Amino acid sequence: MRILLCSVGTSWAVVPEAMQLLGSQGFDEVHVLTTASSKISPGVEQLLRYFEMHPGPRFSISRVQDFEDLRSEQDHMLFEEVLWRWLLQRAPQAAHRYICLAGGYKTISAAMQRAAALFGACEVFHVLCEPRFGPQGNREASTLEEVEQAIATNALRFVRLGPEPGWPQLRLLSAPSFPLESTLQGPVHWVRASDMRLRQHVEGVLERSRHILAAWEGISELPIPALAAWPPSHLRWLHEPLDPVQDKAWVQALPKVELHCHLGGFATHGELLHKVRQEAANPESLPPVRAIPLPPGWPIPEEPIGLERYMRLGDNNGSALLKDPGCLRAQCRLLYEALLADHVAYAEIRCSPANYASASRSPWVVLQEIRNHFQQAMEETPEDRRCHVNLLLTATREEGGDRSRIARHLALAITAAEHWKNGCRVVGVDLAGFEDRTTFATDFEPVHRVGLAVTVHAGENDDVEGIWQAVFKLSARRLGHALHLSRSPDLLRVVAERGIAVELCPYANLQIKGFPLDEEQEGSETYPLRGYLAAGVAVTLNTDNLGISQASLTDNLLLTARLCPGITRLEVLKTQVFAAQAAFANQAERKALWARLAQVPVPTDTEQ
Amino acid sequence: MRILLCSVGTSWAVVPEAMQLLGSQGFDEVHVLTTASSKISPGVEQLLRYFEMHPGPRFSISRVQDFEDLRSEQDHMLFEEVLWRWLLQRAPQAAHRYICLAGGYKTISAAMQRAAALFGACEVFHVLCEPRFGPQGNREASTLEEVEQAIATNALRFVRLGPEPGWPQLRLLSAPSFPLESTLQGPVHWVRASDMRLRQHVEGVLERSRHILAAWEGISELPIPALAAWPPSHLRWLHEPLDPVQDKAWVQALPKVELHCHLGGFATHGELLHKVRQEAANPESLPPVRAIPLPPGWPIPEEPIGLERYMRLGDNNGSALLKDPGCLRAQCRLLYEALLADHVAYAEIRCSPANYASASRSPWVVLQEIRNHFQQAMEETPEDRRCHVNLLLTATREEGGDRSRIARHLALAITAAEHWKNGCRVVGVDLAGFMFATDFEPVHRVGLAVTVHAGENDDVEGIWQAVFKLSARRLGHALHLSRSPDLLRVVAERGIAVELCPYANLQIKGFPLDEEQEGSETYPLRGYLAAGVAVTLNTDNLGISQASLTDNLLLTARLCPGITRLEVLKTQVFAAQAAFANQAERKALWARLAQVPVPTDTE
Numbered sequence A: 001m002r003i004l005l006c007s008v009g010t011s012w013a014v015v016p017e018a019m020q021l022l023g024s025q026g027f028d029e030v031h032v033l034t035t036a037s038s039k040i041s042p043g044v045e046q047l048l049r050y051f052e053m054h055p056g057p058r059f060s061i062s063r064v065q066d067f068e069d070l071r072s073e074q075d076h077m078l079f080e081e082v083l084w085r086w087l088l089q090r091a092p093q094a095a096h097r098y099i100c101l102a103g104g105y106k107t108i109s110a111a112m113q114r115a116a117a118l119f120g121a122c123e124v125f126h127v128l129c130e131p132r133f134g135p136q137g138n139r140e141a142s143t144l145e146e147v148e149q150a151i152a153t154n155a156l157r158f159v160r161l162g163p164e165p166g167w168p169q170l171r172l173l174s175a176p177s178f179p180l181e182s183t184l185q186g187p188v189h190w191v192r193a194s195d196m197r198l199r200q201h202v203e204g205v206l207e208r209s210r211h212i213l214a215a216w217e218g219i220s221e222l223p224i225p226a227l228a229a230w231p232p233s234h235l236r237w238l239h240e241p242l243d244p245v246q247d248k249a250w251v252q253a254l255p256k257v258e259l260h261c262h263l264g265g266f267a268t269h270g271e272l273l274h275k276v277r278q279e280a281a282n283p284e285s286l287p288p289v290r291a292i293p294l295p296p297g298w299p300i301p302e303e304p305i306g307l308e309r310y311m312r313l314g315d316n317n318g319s320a321l322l323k324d325p326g327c328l329r330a331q332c333r334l335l336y337e338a339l340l341a342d343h344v345a346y347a348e349i350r351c352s353p354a355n356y357a358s359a360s361r362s363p364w365v366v367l368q369e370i371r372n373h374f375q376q377a378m379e380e381t382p383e384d385r386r387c388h389v390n391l392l393l394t395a396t397r398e399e400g401g402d403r404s405r406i407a408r409h410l411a412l413a414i415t416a417a418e419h420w421k422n423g424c425r426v427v428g429v430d431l432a433g434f435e436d437r438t439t440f441a442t443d444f445e446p447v448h449r450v451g452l453a454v455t456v457h458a459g460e461n462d463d464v465e466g467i468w469q470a471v472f473k474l475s476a477r478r479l480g481h482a483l484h485l486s487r488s489p490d491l492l493r494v495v496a497e498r499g500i501a502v503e504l505c506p507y508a509n510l511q512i513k514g515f516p517l518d519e520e521q522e523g524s525e526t527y528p529l530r531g532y533l534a535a536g537v538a539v540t541l542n543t544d545n546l547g548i549s550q551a552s553l554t555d556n557l558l559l560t561a562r563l564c565p566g567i568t569r570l571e572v573l574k575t576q577v578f579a580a581q582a583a584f585a586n587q588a589e590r591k592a593l594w595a596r597l598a599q600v601p602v603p604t605d606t607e608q
Numbered sequence B: 001m002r003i004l005l006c007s008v009g010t011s012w013a014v015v016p017e018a019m020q021l022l023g024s025q026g027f028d029e030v031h032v033l034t035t036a037s038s039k040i041s042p043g044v045e046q047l048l049r050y051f052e053m054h055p056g057p058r059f060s061i062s063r064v065q066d067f068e069d070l071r072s073e074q075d076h077m078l079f080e081e082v083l084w085r086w087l088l089q090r091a092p093q094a095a096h097r098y099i100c101l102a103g104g105y106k107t108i109s110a111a112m113q114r115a116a117a118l119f120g121a122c123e124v125f126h127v128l129c130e131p132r133f134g135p136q137g138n139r140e141a142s143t144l145e146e147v148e149q150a151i152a153t154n155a156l157r158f159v160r161l162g163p164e165p166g167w168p169q170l171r172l173l174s175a176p177s178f179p180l181e182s183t184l185q186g187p188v189h190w191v192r193a194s195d196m197r198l199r200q201h202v203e204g205v206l207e208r209s210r211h212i213l214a215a216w217e218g219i220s221e222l223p224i225p226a227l228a229a230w231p232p233s234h235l236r237w238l239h240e241p242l243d244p245v246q247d248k249a250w251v252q253a254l255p256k257v258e259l260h261c262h263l264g265g266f267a268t269h270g271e272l273l274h275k276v277r278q279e280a281a282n283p284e285s286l287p288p289v290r291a292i293p294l295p296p297g298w299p300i301p302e303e304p305i306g307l308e309r310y311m312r313l314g315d316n317n318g319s320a321l322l323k324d325p326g327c328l329r330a331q332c333r334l335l336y337e338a339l340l341a342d343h344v345a346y347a348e349i350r351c352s353p354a355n356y357a358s359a360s361r362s363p364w365v366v367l368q369e370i371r372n373h374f375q376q377a378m379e380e381t382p383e384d385r386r387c388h389v390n391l392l393l394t395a396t397r398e399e400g401g402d403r404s405r406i407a408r409h410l411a412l413a414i415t416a417a418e419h420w421k422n423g424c425r426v427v428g429v430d431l432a433g434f435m436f437a438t439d440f441e442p443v444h445r446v447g448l449a450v451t452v453h454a455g456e457n458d459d460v461e462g463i464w465q466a467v468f469k470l471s472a473r474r475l476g477h478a479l480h481l482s483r484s485p486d487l488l489r490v491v492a493e494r495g496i497a498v499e500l501c502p503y504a505n506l507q508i509k510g511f512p513l514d515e516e517q518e519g520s521e522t523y524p525l526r527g528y529l530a531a532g533v534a535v536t537l538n539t540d541n542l543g544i545s546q547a548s549l550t551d552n553l554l555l556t557a558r559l560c561p562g563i564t565r566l567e568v569l570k571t572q573v574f575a576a577q578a579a580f581a582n583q584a585e586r587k588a589l590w591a592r593l594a595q596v597p598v599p600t601d602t603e
């Protein structure tokens, strides 16, 4: 199969010479494109007369309706679009596309060359004939007789400029996505482009290709491979320090991962608390709303308040209030709404089913209700914006308290691990009672033996033996509030090399323990996020308690800018990638999460 | 700054119209390219007269000596090369480059457009003149006064075709690397291109960029990101099942990682054993060479021989000989030579120094001698061919026996871990037999990584206790992980590496070969790979198994039906990630692994 595409200006004789590129074999098809100038119509007439003879191949003639003459650049873009659509239509494949640039304007010849370079062509050539067929033999061929004479006498020169392979993303473009409106007027078609779509599509493809090629060297240094298509200025902006106030919209639009969120600390005070109370199935059993004033300057107090006061700040919600089934349902639904409004894509929520169990509601019933409410909230949301929520069961140790709650939480987690295989799942346990009790560990071999994962939640104690025991005796895969890893360099090295994640909650850590804010240089009491990042630790930024901390995940990501002097937003993306890798997800959840993370928002402040 | 670049053909009045693109603003300097055809020299003299009467911007004319008229494609390529070199020379900055395609052949205008697209330009434009002049008033401007009248009458139409950014690689190209000669003839330069270097470089970079763009959609599934630059045919070849007979050279040329190699089982027989024995410092004390007949069909026996016979096959070397300082020295150098010849980039060699100690040589002396021999061998090797070697201490256990040797090896590893911090280091311990977690806490306290060796026991409790009671980061010969789905999922999710030795496993345990499809006793490599497990292929004992790392990588084709070469690269990447290396060693290993050999067949 072999077709020929030509552009013709005032000289019509190029086409009869053009078919002689292959000699006697000729072309299987011939197609011609011209402009609307009246000076070509007689040439069209002679072309038709020539085409009457030699009826071997199938012939056609087109013309651009809107291109009378080249008056400005707008005519050039119009002709470019029409020529591109004509090339796609009349030449479905580039392996048998032959393009002749002889006729037309010099701009038209350049456009034909560029179209061949873009969409591909089998051969591109230019026809030359010596001037010995004309008035006194001083002109090139102009009528049929001398055209045939030149054909028979081999008086034509062909410069095969060579094949053009085209670009990979433009070589598979199809004709009917960008159609032409051909009007048959005799044996010649007349074509016109309705829209401009093809030019913007090609320009976008070329810009994306240039951006990918520019950033191709640093593929491994980008946390998300989809960032190579970013323009170099956008990547330079990505490598600048994060701004807490200017980058609010960019962080807000980011797809995030939440790995440390307590269910019972969500609607602890305010409008959310009243909304949860108003949904109670038994309003007469609701305890009265206690008076729990917030510390002045909340959520950023003048001085840290400690873990005890921070726990007591969330007493209007939790064990007391979530024993109501309606309150529990409203709590789960509102937590999912909060997660959706923050563009979270994957969430792990910490729950205590035995804390909300009653005489008629076993812990299994409470766990089933929580999981079913979350699954229902997930299935209602469209998949493009759906946040996948998994569950972690907290096993809190009490100082001198009962061991029964821990044992039944472990058994509940073991059973719910294989009870549910799709949607919302119980993915592990949160051993949050490891402080002042363990510097007695046999309780958790059944957890390991069934494939449940373990995260150990620190208790404000500054010792490093607890972290050691969590890593090596509890086989923990994540660490909560491990803010003193740097004090033991060997422990920090072990945590980095074993791929153990560290869950950091900026607002909770600032409120409970306190760190200097807006210090120009890193000091001895600086937040350990940047030091952990430099040490090779997979660091996650979380919320801990949405209600008590009075801050969202976007707010924590923005506060890391004030806690860590000169942290870059590339490191924010790194934290998100670390969170995605540290999640207790399976192959399908991980695939969906990676698909969601690739859609990083485009910056709008790349102007300096 | 603004530089005007344009060509002239039979006509000359294109450029006097050309620098009027900005009108009264003008241009800082103008440069003109031209051919050697004699039919256009009057245009050249007209140009000279024009800029003699019109001073201001710098003027220059260049003519391609070897190009006169368009006859075939060779002249076109010659003009293209000369034009590209002249473009790089006259206009080094793309932000100050203006190109006009009004003059010359139509192919010349196409070449100017293509050069602007390739290298970038501030603006590409074409100037037109309405034909109203001449004696009949029906022809365009051709004389000087006609040009002046056209300028005054505003009969010039400029088609600003738009700016071109160029390509990222071609935007940085510099003139001196591709120079253009000049032979002055008055005020007109005469240029010529010496060779076709710039054209071939442009074609090669364009082909590579096209390959990158084609392979870009699907970069997440490539083990090495540098594989994108491979041609699509090469990637299609990569995704095809490995051939044990024809892919031997490609596998041999690969940079590899060795994680399970025993020092004492390298020169157990053959001429290599006698090469080691000849280097004894006290040859009179060498034990007599035992008669150890290899099983028929070695290294691929008819029936598996088990672990006892396999261990007894290497009785002519090890503790028998390497108590000799010279024998140990020769053993280490020959092992490093074998590693270099196999293109291994990172090796973890595991040894038992306390087995080699004597009355006068303590285990610490033996360990330091081993380390210094390997470090020296690494030192006389170029860094681009250097194989980095790290050490593992094997704390083997036996029925009853003595626990003193285990304590000595663990303490030795602890001390050596902080002794050396560059070059050859002691990176971990090997537990050949271990649930006795009481005496392995001190190495967790100091940050030593633990690899646990599975014995000839088809048990599942052992792997569980290795993962959770020993905190092992690698598992040796865990061939029955699939019998416990929970254990397989745990190993996959916790990132624990499984180190498989194809030839050793075939000789000791026995597996079907050349199966058409996966069966019940088929090798578990592909099943582990499909389950998300990080699997590494190693050699175990170089001397006893009588096979190299290349030989094991090729045997996996017979063991695993339909295993592709992408999976071989995946196992190499898994081994790189599973090493006990630090940041610098990991960086060097990743740099070495990015140089995958180019396939030689592809079809």
Ligand SMILES: Nc1ncnc2c1ncn2[C@@H]1O[C@H](COP(=O)(O)OP(=O)(O)OP(=O)(O)O)[C@@H](O)[C@H]1O
Binding pocket: A262, A263, A264, A265, A307, A311, A314, A317, A318, A319, A320, A322, A350, A351, A352, A355, A394, A396, A432, A457, A458, A459, A508, A544, A545
């Ligand atoms: N930031 C934290 N640091 C330490 N422990 C915490 C933190 N947040 C929560 N916990 C512990 O986790 C337990 C469970 O918290 P959650 O909010 O999910 O439950 P609850 O319904 O509020 O329970 P409670 O009866 O304790 O009020 C808390 O009781 C507390 O012991």
Ligand SMILES: Nc1ncnc2c1ncn2[C@@H]1O[C@H](COP(=O)(O)OP(=O)(O)OP(=O)(O)O)[C@@H](O)[C@H]1O
Binding pocket: B262, B263, B264, B265, B314, B315, B317, B318, B319, B320, B350, B351, B352, B355, B394, B396, B432, B453, B540, B541
């Ligand atoms: N395939 C294997 N499986 C289990 N143990 C092995 C295997 N190969 C070697 N070993 C043992 O692991 C340890 C590694 O030490 P090394 O490779 O230097 O051997 P060695 O001390 O020279 O051997 P030996 O004294 O047994 O001949 C030795 O105790 C060796 O016997």
Ligand SMILES: [Mg+2]
Binding pocket: A262, A264, A265, A314, A545
């Ligand atoms: Mg709470």
Ligand SMILES: [Mg+2]
Binding pocket: A264, A265, A314, A315, A317, A318, A319
């Ligand atoms: Mg609470």
Ligand SMILES: [Mg+2]
Binding pocket: B262, B264, B265, B314, B318, B541
């Ligand atoms: Mg051995």
Ligand SMILES: [Mg+2]
Binding pocket: B264, B265, B268, B313, B314, B315, B316, B317, B318
């Ligand atoms: Mg031996």
Ligand SMILES: [Zn+2]
Binding pocket: B260, B262, B540, B541
């Ligand atoms: Zn071994």
